[PDB]
Design an enzyme around this catalytic site. Sequence first.
Site, mmCIF file in Angstrom:
data_model
loop_
_atom_site.group_PDB
_atom_site.id
_atom_site.type_symbol
_atom_site.label_atom_id
_atom_site.label_comp_id
_atom_site.label_asym_id
_atom_site.label_seq_id
_atom_site.Cartn_x
_atom_site.Cartn_y
_atom_site.Cartn_z
ATOM 1 C CB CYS A 1 -1.012 -0.075 1.190
ATOM 2 S SG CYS A 1 -1.924 -1.488 1.320
ATOM 3 C CG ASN B 1 -7.482 -1.063 0.985
ATOM 4 O OD1 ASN B 1 -6.566 -0.582 0.430
ATOM 5 N ND2 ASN B 1 -7.237 -2.168 1.906
ATOM 6 C CG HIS C 1 -3.289 3.152 2.484
ATOM 7 N ND1 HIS C 1 -3.972 2.850 1.101
ATOM 8 C CD2 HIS C 1 -3.217 1.948 3.106
ATOM 9 C CE1 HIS C 1 -4.378 1.661 1.199
ATOM 10 N NE2 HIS C 1 -3.914 1.053 2.219
#
Lengths: 325, 326
Positions: A113, A280, A250
């Site tokens: 990520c 996500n 994030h």
Amino acid sequence: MSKAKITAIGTYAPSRRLTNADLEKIVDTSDEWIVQRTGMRERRIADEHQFTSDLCIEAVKNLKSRYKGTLDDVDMILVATTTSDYAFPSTACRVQEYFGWESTGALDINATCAGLTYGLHLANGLITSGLHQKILVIAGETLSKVTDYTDRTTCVLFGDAAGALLVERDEETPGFLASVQGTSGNGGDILYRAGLRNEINGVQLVGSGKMVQNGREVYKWAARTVPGEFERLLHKAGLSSDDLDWFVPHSANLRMIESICEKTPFPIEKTLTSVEHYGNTSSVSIVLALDLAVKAGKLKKDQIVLLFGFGGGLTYTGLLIKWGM
Amino acid sequence: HMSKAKITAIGTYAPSRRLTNADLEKIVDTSDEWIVQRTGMRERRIADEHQFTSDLCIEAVKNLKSRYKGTLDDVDMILVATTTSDYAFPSTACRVQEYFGWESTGALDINATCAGLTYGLHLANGLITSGLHQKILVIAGETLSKVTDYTDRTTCVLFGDAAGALLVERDEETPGFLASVQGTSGNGGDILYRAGLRNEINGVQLVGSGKMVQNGREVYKWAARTVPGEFERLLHKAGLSSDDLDWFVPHSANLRMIESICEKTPFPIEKTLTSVEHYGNTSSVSIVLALDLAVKAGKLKKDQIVLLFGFGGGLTYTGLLIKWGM
């Protein structure tokens, strides 16, 4: 003293939506539970036949249609991903295949990520050192194909998308103001996906090759790491939080971002997210948040932005940048 | 645009089990004589059943550290070039940090196949010259035996396992990086591949079975036309001639290919370092091994001018002119 600036953006998300109503119908969950724990209502899912490289090409095409200059100039392609088409050739090489740029390096990178902010950190150093001029930093993920859809705790989180950022030599005004990094390798068993190996500490991995996360431990690690490094970033750049226009962490989980926003002294209204309608998207979460903000008029040229990408590893790169478009 | 970086230490580790040509004779229909003639390889190293790329890399940093005078506690970046990482996203570089516990470092895996080492040094040079970093570990590690098809005699004789690490740090006195050239031929993607999430390439289904696949002829053809001209361009960018360069260290894929490159670029084979004979094709690691073989043998000395040329699956490459700072 940075000689690099971010000057173009593009994003693509596949067309098929995965709503909470669709998820109630394959796992034992509910729209209300999901929206309350995570903040997401929809995600995009790649077709059976479209992969991360297909998403990255679309994202660059979008940037190409929105950038007043040429991309024949690109001399490096950085693709941050975890769901590459092939072990090799890399996704960056697939991108070069499609647009046909004549003299460019091509590299896939893996920080999960945090991959996007790692890529931008790399571009900043390669340009500022005078090694490169035009660099494409791309994040694209096909999380749906490595998601365990028998697991209520994880399959509700993940979506597919790609996003592309263009970085250039700018000798007038810096576009990168500060950077923080850190790695907590001890957390590797808290967020993982199996590969050639199927054990961590002699302990057999779960998930059958699909993504696995200890959501609470990830949450806790983000909550205790991001605020202090947030502060350290502002200190390194000689800046107050009042000078910070937008905070783009994030987009893993809206409650996590809310929590981070309280522990750090920073307001949620100055925080850009993409989690509500895209879920996500790992390394793409930050690009999606930026492009939604660009399309909405919230993100304007010369504003100060803090991108904080963190993920599996555990590892992160935090960036203070100056919007250059 | 002067470089502020220099490679200052090296370490390698290659797995224990040796895979000789004779061993491969009882596995597939091949001969020792055909192998040494077509590829120049005698032995490869094979990782154990439970040792993986991260194990090899950790052993390589152990080797480097036991050979570096300074400390590694202030390493601020780990780059691991690998195609065979233990896990999909738990980063091999992060496994390396977990072992040594360094307190403030970035960790990142990079994928440019056999070119990952040179790409990793190119990154380190720019990361240090720009002032963003002071001390970087550039690691290459591969467990190719685990992704090798041992029923294909054309490919299973080529590959081995190894790991190697280089330390790069700030040197404001004299540059350790003199020139770089890069290039990508994305349309050669079907020439050297391994299936991941996808199992077709522009329409046609992949072969192997998640195992590595190579068209050895086309890989030979590319690079034979690519490396010579980029070799020369590297020298022009640095303002040097062929006589200023001491050692040539291309990707140790195939001794015949290396000899042929040396034939059509004007550069002598006696000035080129390889590692194919006893380690085979270790992909991104092959250049570090050739480097470490040359330092142990006393052939690679400090301040010598050396050219690394990593090319691989992509097709993509990075070629570097460097001054040995060790």
